[PDB]
Amino acid sequence: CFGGRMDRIGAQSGLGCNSFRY
Amino acid sequence: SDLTVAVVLPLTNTSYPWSWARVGPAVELALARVKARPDLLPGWTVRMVLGSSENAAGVCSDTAAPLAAVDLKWEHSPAVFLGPGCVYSAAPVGRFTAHWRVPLLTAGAPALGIGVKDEYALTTRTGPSHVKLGDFVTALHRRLGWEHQALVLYADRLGDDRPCFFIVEGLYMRVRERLNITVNHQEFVEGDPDHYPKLLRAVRRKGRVIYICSSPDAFRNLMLLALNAGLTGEDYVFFHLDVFGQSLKSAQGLVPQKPWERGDGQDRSARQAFQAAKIITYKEPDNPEYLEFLKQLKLLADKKFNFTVEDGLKNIIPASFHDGLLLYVQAVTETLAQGGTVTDGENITQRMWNRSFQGVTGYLKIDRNGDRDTDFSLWDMDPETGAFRVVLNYNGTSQELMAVSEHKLYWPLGYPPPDVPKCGFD
Amino acid sequence: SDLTVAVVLPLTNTSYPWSWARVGPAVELALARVKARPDLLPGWTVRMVLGSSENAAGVCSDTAAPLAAVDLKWEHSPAVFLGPGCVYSAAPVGRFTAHWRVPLLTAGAPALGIGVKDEYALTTRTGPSHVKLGDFVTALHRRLGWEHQALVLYADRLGDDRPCFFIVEGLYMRVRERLNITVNHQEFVEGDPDHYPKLLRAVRRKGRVIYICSSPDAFRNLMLLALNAGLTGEDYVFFHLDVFGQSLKSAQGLVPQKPWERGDGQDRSARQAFQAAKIITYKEPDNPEYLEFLKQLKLLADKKFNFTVEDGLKNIIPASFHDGLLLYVQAVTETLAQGGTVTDGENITQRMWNRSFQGVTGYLKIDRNGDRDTDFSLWDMDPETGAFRVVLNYNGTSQELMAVSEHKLYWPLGYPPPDVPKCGFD
């Protein structure tokens, strides 16, 4: 989930993360 | 009196589907055809100014590319940008061009976020998108009764453009947008053996309709382990998300098609395992113009680019740059035809959007969002010979699944296994 | 004969800790002291050229900032960049300055990825880092016996700079790097009521040492629900990751400190709930130079910036730009003192790195990585009055936890509850 670049292009779904959104 | 086309692509690395050694001669073909067409920008002399998206190490860069874009913008004030193809190159450049009010054309940048045209304004995608993959998967589930749960395994090499991540992002979001079924997902590292126990465990714990985005060898190894662990087509179906068909030879020769073949004495075991595996790819364009285009592309690349273009699905990327470029030139010609200028980026973009077009890739449709509808093929193995062949084709614009050459989808149980097991996953 | 300083910060939005209305007058103070010091760059006339990191909507941008940086670079050829503070602004700019061989100073950009100085070369951070938060948590766990499992809840407003995410990312990575205990994490959306059943369920299923990064109101509501659901200090400990102390007043007046007070008749219920809650913050600088700096900062901001600087933890950011700038000027003076030039970015950077310094924030230490060690305070409520006060302080350079004013850490059971329950979490 964490450590993957700093571009908003990589934060459109999480997909590695544990989120209730998206 | 002349049109300035800015290009930001890998000018030196020839490993990308959108590398210049391959997109260059496809573009030059497109320009040459504009010259031969008195209906496309008559009198204009379209010039091109190049910029490399790759950094000092030769891979596409989130820094070299945007830097290159600003350099071409202040030095040549171009009317349109071509490329980049990598996601982390395209996202900064697209945001720059959007701020500049300059149109951007690319057959790459398939990532979900590029689809947000509210941000990536005047960005038109004429190659594949990963949401379009979700469209195919949606239609596949709808046509096979899987309306509950799928599991997605993906892996990327550290420091690359994360192609599998973005592939899975697009599939995941679009599929849940349309079906709202449970899509479990797990990332692994191909070179790390610790993950393979975990993956196998998750395979038999988190899904029975399973999509894997990985290298061919990774997918083969996972299949061998699933057979070794007793996971057959009667219960599991493994879709390799190999959109560029890296696990297959070209559609031109090399008959037949055997991805499980490897020459390590494991080939007999891999063929049995691959009876439960199907490969999802982009569709090879059928039209004869495509084949004539491949011949000329090869000739011009070997001529003016010292590069040998080999057959494969990757050639649709330069084919799509070529098509998209013509699609733009017509749009410009149309805008000029009604008193506009080559800098009316909105008028030009809207002329290209929600539009059908005839290119070397055949029929291509730009959707309302500025993205080319993407056709997909489904490969399956012939249980007699073991070779893989296309059995299902998906027309992205009509979202229809058509059986191919009267083939049927191979199932060890005569019909697909259910996406949920008997008395739950326990 | 003169030094050109490029600034990329929010020049118009005054909402950020690193807004120019607040960092401007702090920098002005720093230059004015350079002038008064015959030992710092004698004869040089340090000039400043500004660029706004914010987009047309007035928020810090992943596009406006990198554009501003290129504009200042070709127009003035500066020797050092100042800011940005936002992560998504600083990341592209840092990569640009790294490629340019130009040093970059900022008291913002605390994200984990900026710490990769192999990429963000010549980026020196003189404000907080989120890995430094992981150092504090590590020391906290080490000093309290929690060596198994924690749970982290975080939430961000869509489209912001994702501050909680980066806070949690830094905490998450650093803590597992040093302790290798199980750190569960869950993202939520503050305005979405659906998430609160989920969070409460996850609180009582995934951890007992629990960290929450959210707005004060969110953390208050979660506490009210935890008390309503029977989650007290005898089993659970809730750490609010409120590094800027948004849930508290200023350390200057406003005695006492009551974050559970809200005036909605729920305050009696919130005080009981908050008995199980502790607030983690940055440390307020003690030294009298800091307070004298605050007075001058307020006077100069109201004067030449028409801005009113209020007391609070956010003021350490302009204090750190101020100190960072002096730390650079000395380094440049030192580099000049040995035949170097102001463009020896590596020599200048290495003179700043692995170095202790005395600034308005008191003792500050730049680590071997170019990052300021960050001190943290731990707040706890007095069970008698209910007000919160610092009970523990963490020296980031020495990684020691020192009790504050002979206070003790409040526990309903006399000692902290175990990070694992009785017979498992079931």
Ligand SMILES: *[C@@H]1O[C@H](CO)[C@@H](O[C@@H]2O[C@H](CO)[C@@H](O[C@H]3O[C@H](CO)[C@@H](O)[C@H](O[C@H]4O[C@H](CO)[C@@H](O)[C@H](O)[C@@H]4O)[C@@H]3O)[C@H](O)[C@H]2NC(C)=O)[C@H](O)[C@H]1NC(C)=O
């Ligand atoms: C994937 O699905 C798409 C959506 O259904 C298909 O698009 C269809 O493509 C066909 C041609 O490939 C197109 O047909 C007509 O298009 C013109 C615009 O409407 C129309 O003027 C044409 O008609 C003329 O020519 C014919 C002979 O071809 C004459 O008989 C007519 O009298 C007339 O002079 C042509 O018939 C469809 O409009 C188009 N549909 C949509 C909804 O866009 C894709 O082709 C398909 N791709 C593949 C590979 O299967």
Ligand SMILES: *[C@@H]1O[C@H](CO)[C@@H](O[C@@H]2O[C@H](CO)[C@@H](O[C@H]3O[C@H](CO)[C@@H](O)[C@H](O[C@H]4O[C@H](CO)[C@@H](O)[C@H](O)[C@@H]4O)[C@@H]3O)[C@H](O)[C@H]2NC(C)=O)[C@H](O)[C@H]1NC(C)=O
């Ligand atoms: C958090 O922990 C840090 C690491 O332990 C502390 O750093 C220490 O800070 C002190 C001063 O604040 C510093 O002390 C000496 O530093 C000089 C360099 O070694 C030394 O030359 C000084 O000595 C001179 O002055 C004294 C009077 O002050 C005389 O008696 C001496 O004879 C001499 O003339 C000074 O003593 C430490 O070196 C430094 N340690 C490290 C490892 O850097 C932080 O101060 C601490 N912060 C807080 C807020 O607690």
Ligand SMILES: *[C@@H]1O[C@H](CO)[C@@H](O[C@@H]2O[C@H](CO)[C@@H](O[C@H]3O[C@H](CO)[C@@H](O)[C@H](O)[C@@H]3O)[C@H](O)[C@H]2NC(C)=O)[C@H](O)[C@H]1NC(C)=O
């Ligand atoms: C052309 O592009 C190829 C793919 O973009 C590239 O292949 C890859 O090269 C990188 C090196 O840049 C390899 O990886 C490493 O990246 C960093 C940078 O040193 C390291 O810290 C990592 O640990 C990692 O080892 C990739 O593994 C490699 N991948 C493949 C599939 O080959 C070519 O090198 C490029 N060629 C030229 C001439 O530019």
Ligand SMILES: *[C@@H]1O[C@H](CO)[C@@H](O[C@@H]2O[C@H](CO)[C@@H](O[C@H]3O[C@H](CO)[C@@H](O)[C@H](O)[C@@H]3O)[C@H](O)[C@H]2NC(C)=O)[C@H](O)[C@H]1NC(C)=O
């Ligand atoms: C100064 O900066 C503030 C924070 O950076 C900013 O506050 C925030 O403003 C944004 C609008 O830019 C709000 O959010 C929205 O963002 C997009 C863009 O329209 C929308 O599509 C979203 O749906 C969302 O509504 C934030 O909610 C808001 N946050 C806070 C805490 O106020 C100020 O507006 C900026 N002020 C000026 C004058 O520039």
Ligand SMILES: [Cl-]
């Ligand atoms: Cl590219």
Ligand SMILES: [Cl-]
């Ligand atoms: Cl900023």
